[PDB]
Structure 1
Amino acid sequence: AGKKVLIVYAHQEPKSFNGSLKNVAVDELSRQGCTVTVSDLYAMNFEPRATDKDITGTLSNPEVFNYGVETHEAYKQRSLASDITDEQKKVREADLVIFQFPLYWFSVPAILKGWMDRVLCQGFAFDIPGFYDSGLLQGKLALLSVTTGGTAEMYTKTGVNGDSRYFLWPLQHGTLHFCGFKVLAPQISFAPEIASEEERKGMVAAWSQRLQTIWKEEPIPCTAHWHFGQ
């Protein structure tokens, strides 16, 4: 309690394992007295494309469109599309942002990549200068709760997919830490489609249990060493 959480959720099916992980997070954080908001991207038909429709005012350079430049100015002028502004309000108010999603091509599903691309604009999430430890979302926590098709064994240094931490780099470091977030350790629920009932129920309960003490956790040192080793 005394804390606000935003869950950005990317799964098409409410009855899915991802849906269960999202719901147990809402249930537990709600039980604790926290304020909780969920952005259910597919239900919202969230727009993933970075286009000129994201700026409603006079463009700074109408001859040659540069998304980064135009959205940075639009942010400062308050002429960004309202769907972006609505997400920014949720992020600005949140103390913790949890991303719940199935891994798609070692990354986030495109609808969620679009949320990253359009919501975390210059001026709001970072500035130049004003990134990594000086990012604009400093003071906030972020956590990736991911599900995979591959087993934990396949996601090891000697497994076919390499260690799971490798694919986390662009997301935890390149995006979240870049914007100033401190990153909590990822929650990775491996191969639920293959797992049995005991195992699946076990994974949901492990997440619920972890959430009970989430406010006591320290963030990870989001560095190349943590991700790649040596």
Structure 2
Amino acid sequence: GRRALIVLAHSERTSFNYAMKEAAAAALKKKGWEVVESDLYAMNFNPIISRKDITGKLKDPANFQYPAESVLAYKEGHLSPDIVAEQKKLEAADLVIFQFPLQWFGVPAILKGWFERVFIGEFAYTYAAMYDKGPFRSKKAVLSITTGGSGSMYSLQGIHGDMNVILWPIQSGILHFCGFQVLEPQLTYSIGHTPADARIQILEGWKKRLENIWDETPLYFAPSSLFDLNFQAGFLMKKEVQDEEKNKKFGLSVGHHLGKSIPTDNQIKAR
């Protein structure tokens, strides 16, 4: 018995996004996983950070700062209960699946708000424990994305540009920052021009992948051990790691390109 959380950000039960969530629950339950869901639209989830997220005494109500107040409110246990219930599902869960359509080169607004309200300091990150040292380093996360546009548009030579660049702020900035090991994303391009027989293959392919999802290699992010983790050094890359990397042709990752070339499909394929 391991547990999985499936976060879904689509309003319509008639959608392929909903079909992909149902197929994931089917396949996982049948291998004996426990499955919990957050269907954000069906919950009427509130995505706006406000003062109403703290139900106790504010430290300084004349000069409100969400970072400081939310962290205090987590440690004394008076966060809004809608936030707390989501934090408990995450703690229980070993695997987290995010199922959403790509909207304006990012996550939908309602999923963005979920991250903002649920991933509070101390719970999901500290400045002492970032990246591969973060609270969620026992857990794995995977993005399941659908697009309206075709995969050629998001290739190296496409009108929109490299999909690896677009995924970087989400997979590194949000998921890995908090400690998750991030698996290869499930990219379903141009789903609205796909005939019915091909959609059935894609669903079967998804279910087949989930049977051994735990055994997969994760994506490569630069270990935090390559950097000086303190305020006086500037969180800069160590002088001896800069010397080792000077004469290599490739950079480390999409964000740590170091003025050089980006390793092919850094954010899409494991090494």
Same fold flag (TM > 0.5): yes
* Mapped pair 1:141 → 2:137: no
How many residue pairs get aligned? The number is 229
CA distance in 1, matches of 2:184, 2:190: 19
Comparing 192-201 and 176-185, the one that deviates more: 192-201
State the shift of 1:199 in Å.
2.2
State the shift of 1:96 in Å.
0.6
CA distance in 2, matches of 1:37, 1:85: 15
Equivalent residue, structure 1, for 2:3? 4
Equivalent residue, structure 2, for 1:187? 186
| Equivalence map 1:1-230=2 (5 Å) | 2-223=1-222, 225-227=252-254, 229-230=262-263
Deviation >2 Å, runs of 4+: 222-228
State the SS of the aligned residue for 2:36. Answer: strand
State the SS of the aligned residue for 1:210. Answer: helix
TM-score, normalised to structure 2, is 0.82
Which structure exhibits the higher relative contact order, with contacts defined as CA atoms closer than 8 Å and separated by 6 or more residues?
1
CA RMSD of superposed structures (Å): 1.2
State the SS of the aligned residue for 2:47. Answer: coil
Q: Cα deviation per residue 1:30-83 (whole Å; 9 max; x = unaligned)? A: 101001011000000001001110001111111111111111111111010000
State the SS of the aligned residue for 1:12. Answer: coil
Q: Is the 8 A contact 1:172 1:222 kept in 2?
A: no
Q: In percent, how many aligned pairs have the same letter?
A: 47
State the SS of the aligned residue for 2:141. Answer: strand
State the SS of the aligned residue for 1:193. Answer: helix
AA aligned opposite 2:37: V
State the shift of 1:225 in Å.
4.0
CA distance in 2, matches of 1:181, 1:206: 24
TM-score, normalised to structure 1, is 0.96
State the shift of 1:226 in Å.
4.3
CA distance in 1, matches of 2:124, 2:43: 22
State the shift of 1:209 in Å.
1.2
CA distance in 2, matches of 1:186, 1:200: 18
CA distance in 1, matches of 2:133, 2:63: 31
State the SS of the aligned residue for 1:30. Answer: helix
Structure 1: stretches of 5+ with no match in the other structure: none
Equivalent residue, structure 1, for 2:231? none
State the SS of the aligned residue for 1:146. Answer: strand
Q: Is the 8 A contact 1:182 1:219 kept in 2?
A: yes
AA aligned opposite 1:164: M
AA aligned opposite 2:49: A
AA aligned opposite 1:185: E
CA distance in 2, matches of 1:226, 1:142: 19
AA aligned opposite 2:14: K
